[PDB]
């Protein structure tokens, strides 16, 4: 299965495939100054900032070069109550991605404050 | 396509002159050089010699120096290029067919020639 | 540059593979002169050949040594074929058939 | 047991946009990144690295970035579309061929559009043709080109550029002193940017370039091949001085509404014909240099003659260049004069109508300089060209990309490919 | 020894210099859309683009930000069969890539496959 | 306290405020060749080079995805001579910076040779 082979696929299967979306997120050499070299060179700084925004926010997690990457976070009750059973077995991600939409952000916040917090107390432990 | 269209044969005399054209069409006439040749009745080729079309440049040979005169003239925009082929000192010997050809390439491959004007002194 | 081309006349038949031997120490050219249509290339450098020409030709480099091998000889070969390096041409076999 | 390295030094062979770096322009030198004041030079030992001049990415680059900024200079500049027009035309004041210069009259625009000036222009005869009436004449471009005035103030000197390569690719410069230039060369280095290359446009002569450090150099493609032109590189310069002798004031003809046209007025002093020395004893040995290294490819039995251009277009035909902004054409029939088994004053013809880089539809006037221009430049090599018991070797050009040959010949651009996966015996 | 000094050096010597090419991989503020601005705007982008595919599959390899990283995958002996000692003490690293030329596209796929597994694993382990 | 809000605080205190300068380091999806669209673009490529160049320096130092790292390189005496408390308690970053200006650059380089030394002694340990 290819880029985004596993779209439909449950949610844990589409885990062994993370290399394989992860791998495309980013004469010729000449930029041209025309319609479509101004095209190509807004299409490369493109992917160049959102490869660079994603890879800054694994980065800040702490959760830098890991496709799966474990947390210190707990996880708070009210963004959705659901076994992980029917999650990890019969839904798939775009279902998830629908349901999780609103409280990301915040989850983000908590995610990096973590890491910093246990940044300081590797510095206090040598 | 690409194409070389020569002039009608000509006549001339001992010590006269004789004018063979070449209308080039159909291509870039800029990067592929003009070369004359020259058949002569029952022998093999010989080189007159080549003309740059870009800078005009002619190379011949030794025996054509101070002889033969290879020059060339665009229409606007290079779209047509007539190269013309002069001679002066011009002999029975000099009876022969001049054809120009194309140059493609480094290994001289001359893949078009033209129809071939018969001189006769 | 030097260069030889033997033999000067040769006579064959129809349905036959026919070798013309040409010897040269440059990027060597294969022509077709039809005795007052001016030359037509076939093969050019040592093997390569050109679009509008069928199969029936070919070349083969050999260490200075080139031949043109025409198989399966048709009436419409009966031409002069010469070799060609730079501006060094030699006089054409007459092919007899 | 695979391991992945980062930082390996390998490289292969690509190809990039090189930009500029360097110490009222032309070339918009201003807008180079500051180079280097000490570039940083590793020599790389062991390495052996494989060059081709007349493949060279860099040369086909430069040429392209030359055009592009003598276009962009052309940009803002006057359009002389007005000056086509039919001039009556009368020898300057002279005793006296030398038809050499028109006192050209013309009923020019004015900055309002429904009124005429009767002006007149000293024009160059090679700048004019006569049309039907024997007095009438036009400019050489009229039938086939548009003019554009260059800027005055934009200067024609060549200014020294240094071509880097952009971070995660390098410049190999091969150091060896005898380069055939291409094949092989041993005592490879790294650079990241050239030396200063003076884009120095000439025919026939390379000028104010750089010179070989132990032999005289022949480089051509292929020596076999007429076509291919022998670029002779010199281990010591020629020293050429120029002079155009005449004063030519120059005189402003407001063509439009704050359009200017300046023209050549009159000439305070002599009428005389502009010319480049080349002294007599140096240039003489310089060719036994150069006889010495053709005899080389072409057998000691030789007869290596040296004959004069055999024609063309007046741009191949003579040596061209641009000298104190005034673009000069010298003969250079007595340079090319040997068998080879005091100065050497040039004739040279000036213009101001110019269609460089062989184009129509670009041409250029070069506003007259004033004062007197002088050259003091120096050759460094020849462009070449064999006729196809004796060999004639006549002057060539007209490709400027043979006039940059010269230069990046050493250069390679390749790209660094850092990642590499070697066997060893570890294990995550 | 600078930039790509040890082209030449043997393959074990040129492994203590790899900080010094890494480091190369990456008014004057303003574009200007000329002739040169043109073109250091495109080298800019390309060195950028460069050095992040380099990174982005050392990313998804598992050896970010190591210079040197080694990896579960065993070396198929179709590949090359040469024994360390010349490949470490006698061949410099061009060589190498001389002969490695082909193989080299499969060996990353096995790479970044490996690591995903082991990615799995430890999320199987916590 | 938001982005360089702890500018002024303790050398200390600005330590646990790292994630929030971090984050900030990094129709109008069309380029428009304008005299506003150059300067937009002008700025997203110097904002994606910045960043990339911190980050470059941090994964050579053996310090990426860390946003504090201790290293093993020793702290010679003559960059700066005085105690932690004063450091750690009284002074802010900016006068720290200040302080340190001149010496700055070979430590990097201390750091960086110090990263590969020991990252040899890794692929010498497996
Ligand atoms: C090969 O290189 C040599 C130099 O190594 C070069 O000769 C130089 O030509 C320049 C042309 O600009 C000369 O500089 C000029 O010299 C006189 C005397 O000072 C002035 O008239 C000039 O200044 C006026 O004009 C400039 C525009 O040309 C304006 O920018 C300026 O504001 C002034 O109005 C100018 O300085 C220089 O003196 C010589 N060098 C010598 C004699 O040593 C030669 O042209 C090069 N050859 C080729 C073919 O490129
Ligand atoms: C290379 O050198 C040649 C001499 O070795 C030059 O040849 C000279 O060219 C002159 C100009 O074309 C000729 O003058 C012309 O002669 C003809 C024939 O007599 C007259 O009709 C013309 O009026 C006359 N030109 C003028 C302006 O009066 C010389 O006769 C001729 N010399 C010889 C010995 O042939 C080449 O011109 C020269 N080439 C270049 C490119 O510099
Ligand atoms: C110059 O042209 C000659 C003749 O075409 C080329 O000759 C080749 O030389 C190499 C080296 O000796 C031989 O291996 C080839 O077999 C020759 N080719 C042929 C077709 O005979 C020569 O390479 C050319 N020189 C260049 C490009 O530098
Ligand atoms: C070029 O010709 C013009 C006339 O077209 C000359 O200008 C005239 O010069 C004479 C003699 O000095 C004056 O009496 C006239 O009044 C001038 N007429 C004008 C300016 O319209 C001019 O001198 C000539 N220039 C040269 C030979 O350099
Ligand atoms: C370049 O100079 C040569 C001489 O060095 C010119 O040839 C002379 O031409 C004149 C007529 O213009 C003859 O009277 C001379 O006899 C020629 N001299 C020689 C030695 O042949 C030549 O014309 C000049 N080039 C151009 C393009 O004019
Ligand atoms: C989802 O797609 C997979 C292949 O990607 C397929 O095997 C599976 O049967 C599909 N799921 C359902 C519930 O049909
Ligand atoms: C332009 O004018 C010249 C001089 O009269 C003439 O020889 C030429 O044929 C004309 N056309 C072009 C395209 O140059
Ligand atoms: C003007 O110059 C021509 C050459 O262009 C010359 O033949 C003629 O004699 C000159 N006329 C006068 C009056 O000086
Ligand atoms: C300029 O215009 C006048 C109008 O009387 C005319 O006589 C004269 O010939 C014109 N000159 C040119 C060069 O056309
Ligand atoms: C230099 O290049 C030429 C190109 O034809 C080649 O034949 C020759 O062997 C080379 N010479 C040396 C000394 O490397
Ligand atoms: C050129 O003429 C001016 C006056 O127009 C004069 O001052 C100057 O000296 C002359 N230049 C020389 C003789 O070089
Ligand atoms: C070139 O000009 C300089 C000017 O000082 C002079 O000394 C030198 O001798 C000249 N060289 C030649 C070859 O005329
Ligand atoms: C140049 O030097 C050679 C060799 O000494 C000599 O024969 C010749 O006469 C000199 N002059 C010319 C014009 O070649
Ligand atoms: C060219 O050479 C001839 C001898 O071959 C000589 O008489 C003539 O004057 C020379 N021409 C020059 C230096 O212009
Ligand atoms: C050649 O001329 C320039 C001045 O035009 C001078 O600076 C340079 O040093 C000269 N070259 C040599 C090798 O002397
Ligand atoms: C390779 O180059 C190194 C320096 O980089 C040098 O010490 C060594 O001797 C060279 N190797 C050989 C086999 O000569
Ligand atoms: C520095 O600013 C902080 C708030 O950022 C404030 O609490 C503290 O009192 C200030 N320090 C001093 C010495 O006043």
């Known amino acids: ?126 | 396509q690409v194409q070389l269209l020569q002039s009608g044969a000509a006549v001339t005399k001992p010590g006269a002159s004789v004018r063979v054209s070449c209308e080039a069409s159909g291509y870039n006439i800029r990067d592929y050089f003009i070369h004359w040749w020259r058949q002569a009745p029952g022998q093999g080729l010989q080189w007159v010699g080549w003309i740059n079309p870009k800078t005009g440049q002619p190379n011949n040979p030794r025996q054509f120096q101070g002889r033969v005169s290879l020059t060339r003239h665009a229409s606007w925009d290079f779209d047509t290029y007539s190269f013309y082929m002069d001679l002066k000192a011009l002999r029975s010997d000099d009876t022969a067919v001049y054809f120009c050809a194309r140059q493609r390439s480094d290994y001289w491959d001359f893949d078009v020639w033209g129809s071939g004007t018969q001189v006769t002194v | 540059i030097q260069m030889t081309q033997s033999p000067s006349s040769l006579s064959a038949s129809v349905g036959d593979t026919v070798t013309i031997t040409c010897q040269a120490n440059g990027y060597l050219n294969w022509y077709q002169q039809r005795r007052g249509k001016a030359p037509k290339l076939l093969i050019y450098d040592g093997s390569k050949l050109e679009r509008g020409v069928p199969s029936r030709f070919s070349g083969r480099r050999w260490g200075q040594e080139y031949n043109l091998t025409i198989n399966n000889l048709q009436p419409e070969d009966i031409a002069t074929y010469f070799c060609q390096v730079y501006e060094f041409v030699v006089p054409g076999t007459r092919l007899d058939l | 047991w695979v391991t992945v390295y980062y930082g390996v030094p390998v490289w292969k062979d690509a190809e990039t946009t090189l930009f500029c770096a360097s110490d009222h322009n032309v070339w918009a030198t201003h807008a180079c990144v500051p180079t280097d004041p000490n570039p940083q030079e590793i020599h790389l030992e062991n390495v052996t690295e494989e060059f081709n001049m007349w493949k060279n990415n860099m040369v086909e680059q430069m040429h392209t970035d030359i055009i592009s900024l003598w276009d962009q200079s052309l940009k803002p500049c006057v359009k002389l579309t007005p000056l086509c027009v039919t001039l009556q035309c009368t020898n300057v004041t002279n005793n006296i061929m030398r038809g050499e210069l028109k006192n050209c009259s013309f009923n020019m625009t004015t900055e309002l559009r429904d009124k005429k000036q009767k002006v007149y222009s000293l024009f160059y005869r090679l700048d004019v043709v006569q049309i039907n009436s024997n007095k009438e004449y036009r400019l050489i471009n009229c039938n086939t080109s548009a003019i554009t005035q260059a800027c005055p103030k934009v200067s024609f000197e060549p200014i020294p550029i240094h071509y880097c390569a952009p971070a995660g690719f390098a410049i190999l410069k091969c150091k060896d002193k005898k380069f055939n230039g291409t094949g092989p060369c041993p005592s490879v280095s790294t650079v990241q940017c050239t030396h200063g290359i003076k884009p120095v446009v000439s025919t026939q002569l390379l000028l104010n370039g750089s010179l070989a450090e132990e032999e005289v150099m022949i480089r051509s493609e292929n020596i076999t091949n007429n076509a291919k032109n022998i670029l002779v590189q010199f281990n010591t310069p020629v020293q050429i001085n120029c002079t155009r002798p005449n004063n030519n004031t120059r005189k402003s003809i407001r063509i439009g509404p704050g359009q200017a046209f300046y023209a050549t007025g009159d000439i305070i002093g002599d009428i005389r014909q502009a010319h480049c020395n080349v002294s007599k004893a140096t240039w003489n040995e310089t060719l036994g240099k150069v006889v010495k290294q053709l005899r080389k490819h072409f057998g000691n039995n030789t007869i290596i003659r040296f004959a004069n251009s055999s024609g063309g277009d007046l741009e191949v035909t003579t040596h061209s260049f641009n000298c104190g902004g005034e673009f000069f054409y010298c003969n250079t029939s007595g340079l090319f004069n040997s068998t080879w088994i005091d100065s050497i004053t040039l004739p040279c013809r000036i213009k101001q109508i110019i269609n460089m880089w062989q184009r129509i539809g670009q041409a250029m006037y070069a506003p007259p300089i004033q004062g007197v221009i002088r050259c003091v430049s120096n050759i460094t090599g020849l462009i070449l060209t064999r006729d196809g018991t004796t060999e004639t070797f006549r002057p060539g050009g007209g490709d400027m990309r043979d006039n940059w040959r010269s230069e990046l010949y050493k250069y390679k651009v390749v790209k660094i490919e850092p990642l590499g996966v070697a066997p060893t015996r570890c294990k995550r």
């Not at chain 1, 659901?82 to 629908?98: F, P, V």
């Open chain 1, 1 to 126: 299965l290819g880029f985004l082979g596993a779209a439909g696929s449950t949610m844990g299967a589409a885990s062994m495939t993370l290399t394989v979306q992860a791998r495309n997120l980013l004469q010729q050499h000449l930029l041209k100054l025309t319609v479509w070299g101004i095209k190509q060179l807004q299409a490369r700084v493109l992917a160049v900032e959102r490869y660079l925004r994603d890879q800054q926010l694994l980065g800040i997690w702490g959760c830098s070069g890991k496709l799966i990457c474990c947390t210190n976070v707990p996880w708070n009750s009210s963004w959705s109550n659901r076994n992980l059973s029917e999650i990890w077995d019969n839904m798939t991600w775009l279902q998830w991605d629908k349901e999780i939409s609103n409280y990301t952000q915040i989850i983000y916040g908590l995610l990096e404050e973590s890491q910093n917090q246990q940044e300081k107390n590797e510095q206090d432990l040598l």
